[PDB]
Scaffold this active site. Structure first.
Site, PDB file in Angstrom:
ATOM      1  N   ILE A  26      38.426  40.762  58.346  1.00 30.72           N
ATOM      2  CA  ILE A  26      39.395  40.509  57.285  1.00 30.72           C
ATOM      3  C   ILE A  26      39.424  41.799  56.490  1.00 30.72           C
ATOM      4  O   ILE A  26      40.433  42.540  56.560  1.00 30.72           O
ATOM      5  CB  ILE A  26      38.986  39.326  56.413  1.00 30.72           C
ATOM      6  CG1 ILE A  26      39.055  38.049  57.232  1.00 30.72           C
ATOM      7  CG2 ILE A  26      39.893  39.279  55.152  1.00 30.72           C
ATOM      8  CD1 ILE A  26      38.468  36.817  56.567  1.00 30.72           C
ATOM      9  N   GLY A  27      38.324  42.141  55.809  1.00 32.57           N
ATOM     10  CA  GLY A  27      38.210  43.509  55.244  1.00 32.57           C
ATOM     11  C   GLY A  27      36.888  43.745  54.537  1.00 32.57           C
ATOM     12  O   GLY A  27      35.916  42.993  54.746  1.00 32.57           O
ATOM     13  N   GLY A  32      30.521  43.624  49.895  1.00 32.62           N
ATOM     14  CA  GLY A  32      30.338  43.224  51.290  1.00 32.62           C
ATOM     15  C   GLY A  32      31.566  43.209  52.175  1.00 32.62           C
ATOM     16  O   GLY A  32      32.709  43.407  51.738  1.00 32.62           O
ATOM     17  N   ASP A 145      34.919  37.190  33.712  1.00 31.82           N
ATOM     18  CA  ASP A 145      35.439  38.300  34.560  1.00 31.82           C
ATOM     19  C   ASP A 145      36.251  37.794  35.727  1.00 31.82           C
ATOM     20  O   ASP A 145      36.164  38.318  36.827  1.00 31.82           O
ATOM     21  CB  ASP A 145      34.311  39.197  35.021  1.00 31.82           C
ATOM     22  CG  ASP A 145      34.792  40.570  35.539  1.00 31.82           C
ATOM     23  OD1 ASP A 145      35.730  41.175  34.973  1.00 31.82           O
ATOM     24  OD2 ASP A 145      34.193  40.994  36.536  1.00 31.82           O
TER      25      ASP A 145
HETATM   26  C1  LIG Z   1      46.713  42.343  47.973  1.00 28.34           C
HETATM   27  C2  LIG Z   1      46.200  43.295  49.042  1.00 28.34           C
HETATM   28  C3  LIG Z   1      45.641  42.560  50.234  1.00 28.34           C
HETATM   29  O1  LIG Z   1      44.674  41.811  50.134  1.00 28.34           O
HETATM   30  N1  LIG Z   1      46.311  42.812  51.391  1.00 28.34           N
HETATM   31  C4  LIG Z   1      46.110  42.270  52.686  1.00 28.34           C
HETATM   32  C5  LIG Z   1      47.030  42.644  53.665  1.00 28.34           C
HETATM   33  C6  LIG Z   1      46.974  42.073  54.924  1.00 28.34           C
HETATM   34  C7  LIG Z   1      46.008  41.131  55.222  1.00 28.34           C
HETATM   35  C8  LIG Z   1      45.071  40.758  54.262  1.00 28.34           C
HETATM   36  C9  LIG Z   1      44.010  39.780  54.660  1.00 28.34           C
HETATM   37  O2  LIG Z   1      43.482  39.842  55.765  1.00 28.34           O
HETATM   38  N2  LIG Z   1      43.497  39.016  53.680  1.00 28.34           N
HETATM   39  C10 LIG Z   1      42.722  37.846  53.804  1.00 28.34           C
HETATM   40  C11 LIG Z   1      42.567  37.066  54.944  1.00 28.34           C
HETATM   41  C12 LIG Z   1      41.667  36.013  54.949  1.00 28.34           C
HETATM   42  C13 LIG Z   1      40.893  35.746  53.821  1.00 28.34           C
HETATM   43  N3  LIG Z   1      39.916  34.732  53.880  1.00 28.34           N
HETATM   44  C14 LIG Z   1      38.748  34.534  53.189  1.00 28.34           C
HETATM   45  C15 LIG Z   1      38.068  35.545  52.498  1.00 28.34           C
HETATM   46  C16 LIG Z   1      36.964  35.192  51.726  1.00 28.34           C
HETATM   47  C17 LIG Z   1      36.178  36.203  50.978  1.00 28.34           C
HETATM   48  C18 LIG Z   1      34.836  36.218  50.656  1.00 28.34           C
HETATM   49  C19 LIG Z   1      33.752  35.294  51.043  1.00 28.34           C
HETATM   50  C20 LIG Z   1      32.815  34.862  50.108  1.00 28.34           C
HETATM   51  C21 LIG Z   1      31.787  34.008  50.471  1.00 28.34           C
HETATM   52  C22 LIG Z   1      31.707  33.605  51.789  1.00 28.34           C
HETATM   53  F1  LIG Z   1      30.749  32.700  52.137  1.00 28.34           F
HETATM   54  C23 LIG Z   1      32.589  34.023  52.748  1.00 28.34           C
HETATM   55  C24 LIG Z   1      33.627  34.862  52.369  1.00 28.34           C
HETATM   56  N4  LIG Z   1      34.544  37.304  49.839  1.00 28.34           N
HETATM   57  C25 LIG Z   1      35.667  37.936  49.678  1.00 28.34           C
HETATM   58  S1  LIG Z   1      35.864  39.405  48.739  1.00 28.34           S
HETATM   59  C26 LIG Z   1      35.748  38.710  47.097  1.00 28.34           C
HETATM   60  N5  LIG Z   1      36.711  37.337  50.324  1.00 28.34           N
HETATM   61  C27 LIG Z   1      38.115  37.760  50.280  1.00 28.34           C
HETATM   62  C28 LIG Z   1      36.584  33.856  51.672  1.00 28.34           C
HETATM   63  C29 LIG Z   1      37.298  32.935  52.400  1.00 28.34           C
HETATM   64  N6  LIG Z   1      38.360  33.232  53.156  1.00 28.34           N
HETATM   65  C30 LIG Z   1      41.071  36.514  52.680  1.00 28.34           C
HETATM   66  C31 LIG Z   1      42.030  37.510  52.653  1.00 28.34           C
HETATM   67  C32 LIG Z   1      45.114  41.343  52.997  1.00 28.34           C
END
Ligand SMILES: *CCC(=O)Nc1cccc(C(=O)Nc2ccc(Nc3cc(-c4c(-c5ccc(F)cc5)nc(SC)n4C)ccn3)cc2)c1
EC number: 2.7.11.24
Length: 351
Positions: A26-27, A32, A145
């Site tokens: 995802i990224g 992390g 925050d």
């Molecule tokens: C606005 C810019 C941007 O985000 N652009 C962009 C462009 C194209 C694709 C994406 C993309 O892939 N975004 C995406 C896909 C799927 C998810 N799912 C997701 C993420 C998270 C997560 C966690 C996390 C925390 C705890 C845990 F047990 C597992 C995962 N931590 C973070 S960083 C604060 N994220 C995002 C959780 C659940 N599902 C997210 C975004 C983006």
């Protein structure tokens, strides 16, 4: 162990339990890397976040630890709930990495913020943020925050908050760090060290709502000085009663600046930014600005509460007491790297 396998993901290796299949990036963020995966045990899609050596930085260590501990203190569909926590390392001595697993969401809030403004979507997203915040508050957690990077969304417009915010003491003394920390969503009472109550979190909801409308961060301060300046430029120099609440040294700092009248909310958020050409759209633009004008209030003594926001006509068409009042379930010293390492290891091993 035989219980794990390793997957190459860009610069990184994810070493995960064999139940987790078909990992895809995802990224990455400050805290992390994240992959999507299929969980063959649960038969559902999950997101897996890797924390690498979180104990090696005191801020990261405290965050990881407090978030593992506080996970068990909430239970609400708009707040993160971990499905699993694990480490592939087998002893305290070898321990390096923590993996957190939750339900797979579809997007970061920033992706939704980029989409064309829609009142049904914005109001529903804000309603869910407010339900989450209310729940946190009932559990004794005042976030301070909340920002788009810690909020995720599904294609059905459902939303989750992923973090628990700041240590309890943050906002009880003046905020400037030795390095850059961004504070675009932090309340005035926090950044100026005034102490705070529950509606501190309403400021951040207001920042997010405004960002949804503008498609731009409202108060993008380059540093602590510029942060305050972005605020007063738009909203005006706050009232003398607010200045009187500042510690004298802080008061001189705050007042040694240009005096601004602030701009009205129609100038801050013009009609052109909202859907037009129907009575419904005109009324909703008015209600959205009204709510913005009540949340984006520098002085917390004059800022709307969480309940008032939930009951506002912009939000209240979604109001369901089962969501709004869902109840939560029935120590912040500093430590060395080795102490933090053991504390985190113990939390991981025990759930
Ligand atoms: C606005 C810019 C941007 O985000 N652009 C962009 C462009 C194209 C694709 C994406 C993309 O892939 N975004 C995406 C896909 C799927 C998810 N799912 C997701 C993420 C998270 C997560 C966690 C996390 C925390 C705890 C845990 F047990 C597992 C995962 N931590 C973070 S960083 C604060 N994220 C995002 C959780 C659940 N599902 C997210 C975004 C983006």
């Amino acid at each position: 162990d035989n219980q794990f396998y390793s997957v190459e993901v860009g610069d990184s290796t994810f070493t995960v339990l064999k139940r987790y299949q078909n990992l895809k990036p995802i990224g990455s963020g400050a805290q992390g890397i994240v992959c999507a995966a299929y969980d063959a045990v649960l038969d559902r899609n999950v997101a897996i976040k890797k924390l690498s050596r979180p104990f090696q930085n005191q801020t990261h260590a405290k965050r990881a630890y407090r978030e593992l501990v506080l996970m068990k203190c909430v239970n609400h569909k708009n707040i993160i709930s971990l499905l699993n926590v694990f480490t592939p390392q087998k002893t305290l001595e070898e321990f390096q990495d923590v993996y957190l697993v939750m339900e797979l969401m579809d997007a970061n809030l920033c992706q939704v913020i980029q989409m064309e403004l829609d009142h049904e979507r914005m109001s529903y997203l804000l309603y869910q943020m407010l339900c989450g915040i209310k729940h946190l508050h009932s559990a004794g957690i005042i976030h301070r925050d909340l920002k788009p990077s810690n909020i995720v969304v599904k294609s059905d417009c459902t939303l989750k908050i992923l973090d628990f915010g700041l240590a309890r003491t943050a906002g009880t003394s003046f905020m400037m760090t030795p390095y850059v920390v961004t504070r675009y969503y932090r309340a005035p009472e926090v950044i100026l060290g005034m102490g705070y109550k529950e509606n501190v979190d309403i400021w951040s909801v207001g920042c997010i709502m405004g960002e949804m409308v503008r498609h731009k961060i409202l108060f993008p301060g380059r540093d602590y000085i510029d942060q305050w300046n972005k605020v007063i430029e738009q909203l005006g120099t706050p009232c003398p009663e607010f200045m009187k609440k500042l510690q004298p040294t802080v008061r001189n700092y705050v007042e040694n600046r240009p005096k601004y009248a602030g701009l009205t909310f129609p100038k801050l958020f013009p009609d052109s930014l909202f859907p037009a050409d129907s009575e419904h759209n005109k009324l909703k633009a008015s209600q959205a600005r009204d709510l913005l004008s009540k949340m984006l209030v520098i002085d917390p003594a004059k800022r709307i509460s969480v309940d008032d926001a939930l009951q506002h006509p912009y939000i209240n068409v979604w109001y369901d007491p089962a969501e709004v009042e869902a109840p939560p379930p029935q120590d912040e010293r500093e430590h060395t790297i080795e102490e933090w390492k053991e504390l985190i290891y113990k939390e991981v091993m025990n759930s």
